[PDB]
């Protein structure tokens, strides 16, 4: 049972870390987006 | 305290007040080969020759804005608030791009803009008041490629066409475009005088050096053509009927004119492609100095600026900050 | 409340605070030994009544009480915290004896008495920095050398390799070809400096052979250092001379399989079914490890003897000096891990093999 049991630990704990790294990386870009579309608006402020 | 504009131009800089209509003082610029500032205390030099013999005042008191071109790059412009703010010490700030206050100057925020200064020419589409980077065709086939069909054209005249003498040698061709340069095909032509009183027929010459920009490299209207193609889609159609010109490099005879059909055979008949013709030389001379006039002068104005404040609390980033 | 991440390097420890990028202090990891026994660059500082000794020979311990000061004087100086109330995360070597095991975690519980602990292997650590899932880790640490099959986030101990052949090791033969080139080494200082030198200019050549052409006929790779004295030192050849020793051990009069050889050797070890996989997820270690040419030429290497038929997709982090602290400070800072820890009553109530029973 225990030989069983720490491969799921394994798997779950690889999973939990892939998981994190794929929000970083989609937290980054779309604060890149919301950034450059703050920028816009703030252009069209102007245009206001 | 009446906010001082002042334009950094490539091969003349036009400065003054906001609220005044003309740039009091236009004098040749040089530290901006390439289009931005490429030799710092040059540049710092001019900009305190202006200050102090071009419009006799400190810069300390009245708030600034200065111009900028649309391809320059950032670390220009934290360097240049950097330099201006610590120098200078001006109480308001502020950086605009030259394409956007043509576009202000005429009146009409969406539209496309072409001109031309030392070693450049180009085309930048403007949608929102906002300069679309990706749409901007920069091209070699500036005036000063013109004039220097000229100069040689000159050379092979044979006629004697320091640094002052260089100064008149480029003046002079300069001056003989505006004369003579128009877009035996061209039937007899001027008497134009140089002022020790030499001259010749200048015959087909006028009309083959202007055609340069258009065929000597992209010509200006390829340079158009497709900057609308890498922007967006739908928007194009206004751009068509907002395209505008300035430049003193822009003034040929029948420049515009030629513009108008080289365009109007290539756009889609169908479109309703305009030129809005501020040909006038004063009108393109001051057109960039005329938006920015503008803007400094609006009551909106006193938001704008990054004051002296923002420098204190924030460096050079304020600058990507408070500057579309 | 804090979160406590410590590596320990095969020759200087670095250690830091989960949530963290870089380690809160690092320094070489000897200690001092009066003929009061101080610790690493502490004890360094007093060499004339305190005598260099690395409790991590070959990358394993040698005797407790100089890791008991080691941590003694990290947490009373660097750190100048209390660990005792938050979690201890501990790294160490794959295929350690359990003794090492269950005698550091009595350490712990009782010497310091830190609520939460917990212990995994440095290589897996470092893939978790590296954000993949199946892959062949290369052990290019600082002491000693590994090649660890990781699986699912699970490894075989059994086709592990090991060598204990690291940047120490490639330094003394640095400092011997040196000498022969018409120079001396000796203490302490000249060690140093012979790796600083390394650190500088040493790279990996591409085709040795040529390299060597270049070297006698391209003065190019004989270059110029300011030695601390101020001496100028022509290095060509040697800049990469002992680089290639870590595919030939011949170059110091030892016999095995190349680095590159070693790692075929483990990729075959393992099961075939993955090992294309395997070849699409190399890694590296050890900032000891970075030097130029190096990953491509083990990339070119790998596609050579490995067939071609496979993906050999290499994996080179420019960062991994760190891989395994980042990964330590990645996995302290995950929800699902902070039950995992082991509390102090749960020693209290099992006793050392408790590590055994459940930190895996």
């Given at each position: 049972?225990?030989?069983?049991?720490?491969?799921?630990?394994?798997?779950?704990?690889?999973?939990?870390?892939?998981?994190?790294?794929?929000?970083?990386?989609?937290?980054?870009?779309?604060?890149?987006?919301?950034?450059?579309?703050?920028?816009?608006?703030?252009?069209?402020?102007?245009?206001? | 305290?009446?906010?001082?504009?002042?334009?950094?131009?490539?091969?003349?800089?036009?400065?003054?007040?906001?609220?005044?209509?003309?740039?009091?003082?236009?004098?040749?610029?040089?530290?901006?080969?390439?289009?931005?500032?490429?030799?710092?205390?040059?540049?710092?030099?001019?900009?305190?020759?202006?200050?102090?013999?071009?419009?006799?005042?400190?810069?300390?008191?009245?708030?600034?804005?200065?111009?900028?071109?649309?391809?320059?790059?950032?670390?220009?412009?934290?360097?240049?608030?950097?330099?201006?703010?610590?120098?200078?010490?001006?109480?308001?700030?502020?950086?605009?791009?030259?394409?956007?206050?043509?576009?202000?100057?005429?009146?009409?925020?969406?539209?496309?803009?072409?001109?031309?200064?030392?070693?450049?020419?180009?085309?930048?589409?403007?949608?929102?008041?906002?300069?679309?980077?990706?749409?901007?065709?920069?091209?070699?086939?500036?005036?000063?490629?013109?004039?220097?069909?000229?100069?040689?054209?000159?050379?092979?005249?044979?006629?004697?066409?320091?640094?002052?003498?260089?100064?008149?040698?480029?003046?002079?061709?300069?001056?003989?475009?505006?004369?003579?340069?128009?877009?035996?095909?061209?039937?007899?032509?001027?008497?134009?005088?140089?002022?020790?009183?030499?001259?010749?027929?200048?015959?087909?010459?006028?009309?083959?050096?202007?055609?340069?920009?258009?065929?000597?490299?992209?010509?200006?209207?390829?340079?158009?053509?497709?900057?609308?193609?890498?922007?967006?889609?739908?928007?194009?159609?206004?751009?068509?009927?907002?395209?505008?010109?300035?430049?003193?490099?822009?003034?040929?005879?029948?420049?515009?004119?030629?513009?108008?059909?080289?365009?109007?055979?290539?756009?889609?008949?169908?479109?309703?492609?305009?030129?809005?013709?501020?040909?006038?030389?004063?009108?393109?001379?001051?057109?960039?100095?005329?938006?920015?006039?503008?803007?400094?002068?609006?009551?909106?104005?006193?938001?704008?600026?990054?004051?002296?404040?923002?420098?204190?609390?924030?460096?050079?980033?304020?600058?990507?900050?408070?500057?579309? | 409340?804090?979160?406590?991440?410590?590596?320990?390097?095969?020759?200087?420890?670095?250690?830091?605070?989960?949530?963290?990028?870089?380690?809160?202090?690092?320094?070489?990891?000897?200690?001092?030994?009066?003929?009061?026994?101080?610790?690493?660059?502490?004890?360094?500082?007093?060499?004339?009544?305190?005598?260099?000794?690395?409790?991590?020979?070959?990358?394993?311990?040698?005797?407790?009480?100089?890791?008991?000061?080691?941590?003694?004087?990290?947490?009373?100086?660097?750190?100048?915290?209390?660990?005792?109330?938050?979690?201890?995360?501990?790294?160490?070597?794959?295929?350690?004896?359990?003794?090492?095991?269950?005698?550091?975690?009595?350490?712990?519980?009782?010497?310091?008495?830190?609520?939460?602990?917990?212990?995994?292997?440095?290589?897996?650590?470092?893939?978790?920095?590296?954000?993949?899932?199946?892959?062949?880790?290369?052990?290019?640490?600082?002491?000693?050398?590994?090649?660890?099959?990781?699986?699912?986030?699970?490894?075989?101990?059994?086709?592990?390799?090991?060598?204990?052949l690291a940047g120490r090791d490639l330094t003394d033969y640095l400092?011997?070809?040196?000498?022969?080139?018409?120079?001396?080494?000796?203490?302490?200082?000249?060690?140093?400096?012979?790796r600083?030198?390394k650190?500088?200019?040493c790279?990996?050549?591409?085709?040795?052979?040529?390299?060597?052409?270049?070297?006698?006929?391209?003065?190019?790779?004989?270059?110029?250092?300011?030695?601390?004295?101020?001496?100028?030192?022509?290095?060509?050849?040697?800049?990469?001379?002992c680089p290639?020793a870590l595919?030939?051990?011949?170059?110091?009069?030892?016999?095995?399989?190349?680095?590159?050889?070693?790692?075929?050797?483990?990729?075959?070890?393992?099961?075939?079914?993955?090992?294309?996989?395997?070849?699409?997820?190399?890694?590296?270690?050890?900032?000891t490890?970075?030097?130029?040419?190096?990953?491509?030429?083990?990339?070119?290497?790998?596609?050579?003897?490995?067939?071609?038929?496979?993906?050999?997709?290499?994996?080179?982090?420019?960062?991994?000096?760190?891989?395994?602290?980042?990964?330590?400070?990645?996995?302290?800072?995950?929800?699902?891990?902070?039950?995992?820890?082991?509390?102090?009553?749960?020693?209290?109530?099992?006793?050392?093999?408790?590590?055994?029973?459940?930190?895996?």
């Amino acid at each position: 049972q225990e030989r069983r049991w720490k491969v799921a630990a394994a798997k779950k704990l690889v999973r939990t870390v892939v998981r994190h790294h794929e929000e970083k990386q989609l937290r980054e870009e779309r604060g890149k987006k919301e950034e450059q579309s703050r920028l816009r608006r703030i252009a069209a402020s102007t245009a206001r | 305290v009446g906010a001082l504009v002042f334009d950094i131009g490539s091969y003349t800089v036009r400065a003054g007040y906001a609220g005044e209509d003309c740039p009091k003082v236009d004098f040749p610029t040089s530290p901006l080969k390439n289009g931005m500032v490429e030799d710092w205390d040059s540049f710092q030099a001019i900009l305190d020759h202006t200050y102090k013999m071009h419009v006799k005042s400190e810069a300390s008191l009245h708030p600034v804005l200065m111009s900028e071109a649309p391809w320059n790059t950032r670390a220009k412009r934290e360097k240049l608030t950097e330099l201006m703010f610590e120098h200078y010490n001006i109480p308001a700030f502020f950086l605009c791009k030259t394409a956007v206050l043509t576009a202000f100057a005429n009146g009409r925020s969406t539209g496309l803009i072409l001109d031309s200064g030392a070693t450049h020419t180009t085309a930048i589409p403007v949608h929102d008041g906002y300069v679309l980077q990706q749409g901007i065709v920069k091209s070699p086939l500036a005036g000063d490629f013109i004039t220097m069909q000229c100069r040689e054209l000159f050379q092979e005249m044979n006629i004697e066409l320091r640094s002052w003498h260089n100064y008149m040698c480029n003046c002079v061709i300069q001056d003989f475009q505006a004369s003579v340069l128009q877009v035996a095909a061209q039937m007899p032509t001027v008497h134009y005088e140089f002022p020790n009183g030499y001259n010749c027929d200048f015959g087909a010459e006028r009309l083959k050096i202007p055609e340069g920009l258009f065929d000597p490299m992209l010509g200006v209207s390829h340079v158009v053509t497709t900057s609308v193609g890498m922007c967006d889609i739908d928007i194009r159609p206004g751009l068509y009927g907002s395209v505008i010109v300035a430049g003193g490099n822009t003034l040929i005879q029948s420049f515009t004119d030629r513009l108008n059909r080289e365009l109007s055979q290539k756009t889609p008949p169908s479109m309703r492609l305009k030129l809005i013709a501020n040909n006038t030389t004063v009108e393109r001379r001051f057109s960039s100095w005329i938006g920015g006039s503008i803007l400094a002068s609006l009551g909106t104005f006193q938001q704008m600026w990054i004051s002296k404040q923002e420098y204190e609390e924030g460096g050079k980033q304020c600058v990507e900050r408070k500057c579309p | 409340i804090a979160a406590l991440v410590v590596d320990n390097g095969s020759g200087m420890c670095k250690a830091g605070f989960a949530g963290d990028d870089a380690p809160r202090a690092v320094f070489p990891s000897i200690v001092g030994r009066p003929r009061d026994s101080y610790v690493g660059d502490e004890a360094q500082s007093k060499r004339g009544i305190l005598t260099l000794k690395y409790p991590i020979e070959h990358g394993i311990v040698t005797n407790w009480d100089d890791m008991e000061k080691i941590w003694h004087h990290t947490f009373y100086n660097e750190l100048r915290v209390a660990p005792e109330e938050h979690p201890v995360l501990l790294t160490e070597a794959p295929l350690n004896p359990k003794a090492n095991r269950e005698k550091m975690t009595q350490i712990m519980f009782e010497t310091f008495n830190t609520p939460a602990m917990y212990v995994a292997i440095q290589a897996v650590l470092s893939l978790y920095a590296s954000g993949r899932t199946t892959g062949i880790v290369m052990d290019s640490g600082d002491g000693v050398t590994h090649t660890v099959p990781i699986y699912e986030g699970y490894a075989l101990p059994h086709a592990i390799l090991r060598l204990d052949l690291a940047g120490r090791d490639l330094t003394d033969y640095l400092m011997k070809i040196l000498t022969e080139r018409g120079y001396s080494f000796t203490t302490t200082a000249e060690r140093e400096i012979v790796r600083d030198i390394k650190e500088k200019l040493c790279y990996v050549a591409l085709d040795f052979e040529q390299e060597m052409a270049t070297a006698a006929s391209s003065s190019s790779l004989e270059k110029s250092y300011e030695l601390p004295d101020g001496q100028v030192i022509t290095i060509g050849n040697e800049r990469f001379r002992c680089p290639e020793a870590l595919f030939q051990p011949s170059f110091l009069g030892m016999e095995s399989c190349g680095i590159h050889e070693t790692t075929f050797n483990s990729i075959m070890k393992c099961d075939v079914d993955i090992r294309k996989d395997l070849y699409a997820n190399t890694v590296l270690s050890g900032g000891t490890t970075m030097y130029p040419g190096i990953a491509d030429r083990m990339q070119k290497e790998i596609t050579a003897l490995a067939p071609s038929t496979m993906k050999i997709k290499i994996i080179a982090p420019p960062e991994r000096k760190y891989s395994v602290w980042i990964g330590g400070s990645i996995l302290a800072s995950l929800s699902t891990f902070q039950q995992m820890w082991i509390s102090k009553q749960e020693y209290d109530e099992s006793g050392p093999s408790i590590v055994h029973r459940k930190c895996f």
